Amino acid sequence: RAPDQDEIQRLPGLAKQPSFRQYSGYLKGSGSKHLHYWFVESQKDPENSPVVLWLNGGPGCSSLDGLLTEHGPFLVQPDGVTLEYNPYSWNLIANVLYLESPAGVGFSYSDDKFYATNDTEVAQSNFEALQDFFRLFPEYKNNKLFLTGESYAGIYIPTLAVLVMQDPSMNLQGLAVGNGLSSYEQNDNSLVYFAYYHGLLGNRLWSSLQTHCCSQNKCNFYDNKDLECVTNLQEVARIVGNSGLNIYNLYAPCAGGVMDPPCTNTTAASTYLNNPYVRKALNIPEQLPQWDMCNFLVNLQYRRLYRSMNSQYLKLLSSQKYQILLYNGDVDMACNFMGDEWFVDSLNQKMEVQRRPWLVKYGSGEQIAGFVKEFSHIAFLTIKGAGHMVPTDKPLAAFTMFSRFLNKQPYE
Amino acid sequence: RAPDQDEIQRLPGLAKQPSFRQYSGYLKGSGSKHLHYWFVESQKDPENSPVVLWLNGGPGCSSLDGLLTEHGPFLVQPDGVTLEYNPYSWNLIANVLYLESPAGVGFSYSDDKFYATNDTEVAQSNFEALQDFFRLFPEYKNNKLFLTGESYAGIYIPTLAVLVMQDPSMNLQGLAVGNGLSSYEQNDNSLVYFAYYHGLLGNRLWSSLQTHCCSQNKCNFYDNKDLECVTNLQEVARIVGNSGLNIYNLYAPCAGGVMDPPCTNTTAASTYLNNPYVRKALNIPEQLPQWDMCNFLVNLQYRRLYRSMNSQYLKLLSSQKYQILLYNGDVDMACNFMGDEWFVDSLNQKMEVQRRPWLVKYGSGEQIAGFVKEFSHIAFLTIKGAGHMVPTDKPLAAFTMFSRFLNKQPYE
Ligand SMILES: *[C@](O)(c1noc(-c2ccccc2)n1)[C@H](CC)NC(=O)[C@H](CC(C)C)NC(=O)N1CCOCC1
Ligand SMILES: *[C@](O)(c1noc(-c2ccccc2)n1)[C@H](CC)NC(=O)[C@H](CC(C)C)NC(=O)N1CCOCC1
Ligand SMILES: *[C@@H]1O[C@H](CO)[C@@H](O)[C@H](O)[C@H]1NC(C)=O
Ligand SMILES: *[C@@H]1O[C@H](CO)[C@@H](O)[C@H](O)[C@H]1NC(C)=O
Ligand SMILES: *[C@@H]1O[C@H](CO)[C@@H](O)[C@H](O)[C@H]1NC(C)=O
Numbered sequence A, B: 001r002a003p004d005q006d007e008i009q010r011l012p013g014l015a016k017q018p019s020f021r022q023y024s025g026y027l028k029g030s031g032s033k034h035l036h037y038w039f040v041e042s043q044k045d046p047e048n049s050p051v052v053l054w055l056n057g058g059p060g061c062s063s064l065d066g067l068l069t070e071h072g073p074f075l076v077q078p079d080g081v082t083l084e085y086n087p088y089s090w091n092l093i094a095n096v097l098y099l100e101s102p103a104g105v106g107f108s109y110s111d112d113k114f115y116a117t118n119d120t121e122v123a124q125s126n127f128e129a130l131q132d133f134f135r136l137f138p139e140y141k142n143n144k145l146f147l148t149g150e151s152y153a154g155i156y157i158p159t160l161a162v163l164v165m166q167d168p169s170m171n172l173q174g175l176a177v178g179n180g181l182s183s184y185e186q187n188d189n190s191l192v193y194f195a196y197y198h199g200l201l202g203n204r205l206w207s208s209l210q211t212h213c214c215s216q217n218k219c220n221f222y223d224n225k226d227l228e229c230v231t232n233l234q235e236v237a238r239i240v241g242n243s244g245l246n247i248y249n250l251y252a253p254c255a256g257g258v259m260d261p262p263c264t265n266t267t268a269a270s271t272y273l274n275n276p277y278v279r280k281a282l283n284i285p286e287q288l289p290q291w292d293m294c295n296f297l298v299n300l301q302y303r304r305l306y307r308s309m310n311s312q313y314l315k316l317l318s319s320q321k322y323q324i325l326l327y328n329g330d331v332d333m334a335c336n337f338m339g340d341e342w343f344v345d346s347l348n349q350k351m352e353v354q355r356r357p358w359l360v361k362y363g364s365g366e367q368i369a370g371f372v373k374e375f376s377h378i379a380f381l382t383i384k385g386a387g388h389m390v391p392t393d394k395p396l397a398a399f400t401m402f403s404r405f406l407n408k409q410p411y412e
């Protein structure tokens, strides 16, 4: 019924043993690829709880970021030694499959160590690994399956979903993308607005942008050839990303001051997972190189193929079989909320609902946790005051949203 | 040399006695008005430290909000009983005069209890009270004087400054306004942008606003007569201010859930100052009614006269004798940063400097604390991630800014 050689017996750093079973080993991707997974079964009724795949983005970043720092059952502490139980873990109500992907990311590897890849190969390799998961965990084949991820997984998840939807053996029910890259064009255009209206660009630069980049009511901050325009957008990019502002959360400090995503400090997770006894407990082959949160070389060699997920989401929507959610922390600048809201609105789906706040109960009382824009089979949500890593910044709100999604309830 | 009957001997709730002298009593305003002051001398060298007037806004709100909750030498704790020393107090480097104004606000009163007033009378009464302060504290007449305040004090301070500048006996050196109301028009126009680009309004409403309120490149969200326009702006106002979003800090909870400014809880300060022994220590006449942070009736009866401080600041700038600062926490929606930046840019002053980040040292290191836009004798600054009450939300950054201002140093 399970790869019991993969079972995690006693995880270092945990003061209490888990009530749920958990597994760490390798799923077969395409060719010679072996993708490191860490599967944490539901804390409540895993036999009948959904199976939820989690993919972090990059490209080249590890989904074990999602486990140990966002919504895993325990989170690594600043000592890089202690794990503490997370009261907002997504595995409270789901069997969560964190997958280090593509090959070369974290503990994932391949026999030839050739890690140059692309969107289509990545989707196909993720698909084969999910096939392997269900060969390894056959008692999970009939559980409702949701595909979820973050950041560049805005591309990984919908492309993977299109493959999965053609496999009647997988009980695909839904996909959720957090601060996802869905449209380079909508991302880039929305980002320049976001920057000005969050007080990062002044009047002089804005007016320069307006002159060289825009024609009457429409701005092009994406593929404009205009000369001063390219120049100005270079300045925007510098301000937003290369000046000491944290691009992942405008209102958070830049770690380090004004494999090392900018303004971020991955030392806790890194120190934890490179502990030799941690790797033993996670059944990592000793010969594998050190764990990094993001593989520089995977990212360097990656050929990005899709500029928009418009056609993927229209395909997923046409079946009317799946619930889809795009959610953005609204102080993120890497994949800002507005570009994904524009993106969802532009799918032009039926049953449009008026935009509303959605609430969470804090003690403190009901608070607005964000806004929800709903259509048939698809909702866009903001998470108010969260950056790129929504479940780290607003764990209760993230858990509440996640539960409403799995249960196909209204978000409000 | 001082009204020693006003001296505060032993303030309830303080575990240690202050190193500085402090005073609480009444300054004579115009007619029968008596304005309650609380003056806290500098913790370092009060004889040669600047005199800084602080005014909160409303109209009808108490400057003792500024003392006990923003930048006073001690801050009231959630028990409404304990005061704790504030390591970022503005009185570390200044003699700070907190003035409850106009008559009827907090412990301020008048013999006829007639509290209907207006901008011009308020400025003239504040002016006479400052004259009285210097009659009561004559050893302070030659200290550099700065006039500072917050919110509606965006109107109080510049109007007062114009009066003070005509009095050669006062050594006026500068004025600073935090999240100030400077221009109803620039406030309202900037606010509708701010709302859309912070994800509070969706596409449908934005497009409706664009259609009914705007003509080609210019929007009028201020005095538009257009019909759907008024309707839509009513919806914006509802979303921003009457729906459970905290207008003073978009990213903060609304106290109470989705004399009581909305989403705010003044119980700590209120419980402290209504303690009968607190009032005795502050030399408050026992017959005075209870302390409220904002006087409902003062605000109700207030006749607001100025729609813009353009002409006041141009007068203050013409002398070239004063340094001026407008600073806004950038997640405030009551007086959003963008309207005040537009306002300062529109004064069209010389020696314009390119817009820059300004830094603060946290331990954590240097962090961007906001952006600074500088001209001759006037700077606009943002405080990144602060709401309406900048010194509560970012006390170190507020103190750092305040020190650079008093010392006429660059903000960066
Ligand atoms: C997203 O895919 C992502 N994946 O991992 C992260 C991450 C952020 C903070 C901490 C840990 C992980 N984010 C985004 C989508 C834009 N990808 C990234 O932000 C890239 C992360 C690299 C692989 C280290 N970075 C970039 O795309 N850029 C482009 C602009 O120049 C700076 C970095
Ligand atoms: C500003 O003058 C101000 N003065 O005191 C405050 C304050 C905010 C939070 C907590 C404690 C004090 N702010 C602003 C300038 C717009 N004034 C206010 O926000 C008014 C406060 C009243 C007097 C209680 N409120 C309003 O102007 N409105 C107008 C729109 O409808 C709602 C309240
Ligand atoms: C990074 O994180 C580690 C572990 O939490 C911490 O000890 C270290 O000081 C952090 N900061 C920097 C700037 O390295
Ligand atoms: C993506 O990768 C596959 C597998 O290597 C390769 O055959 C294919 O040509 C690639 N696609 C592109 C456009 O490079
Ligand atoms: C208001 O503040 C007081 C004092 O800090 C606190 O005890 C009370 O619970 C607060 N909240 C509400 C909703 O009254």
Ligand SMILES: *[C@@H]1O[C@H](CO)[C@@H](O)[C@H](O)[C@H]1NC(C)=O
Binding pocket: B117, B118, B120, B121, B303, B305
């Ligand atoms: C403001 O108040 C003064 C004092 O009462 C009064 O004489 C004056 O007419 C007022 N101004 C206006 C425009 O109401």
